[PDB]
Design a protein around this ligand. Sequence first.
Ligand SMILES: [Cl-]
Length: 90
Amino acid sequence: MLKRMYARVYGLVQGVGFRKFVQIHAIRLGIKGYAKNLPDGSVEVVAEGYEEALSKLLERIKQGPPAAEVEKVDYSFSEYKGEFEDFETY
Ligand SMILES: [Cl-]
């Protein structure tokens, strides 16, 4: 089943390779969407893909690359919209 996920990642998560980390792992998993740095120092992820793939990505996002310290991930699933054609960072 396809689903959409919105997640916010908090901690030491900017300037540590986090968005690229999410992208690499999303692409591996066939997930489309984006990882964005927000002005509050958090990372916003919108992801579309299969439920299992989204669970695997969530497990990655909860850890981050070695340099990151992820304190909190707040997320929700919603209905798939077929919006994205690739996984981008910005
Ligand atoms: Cl980062």
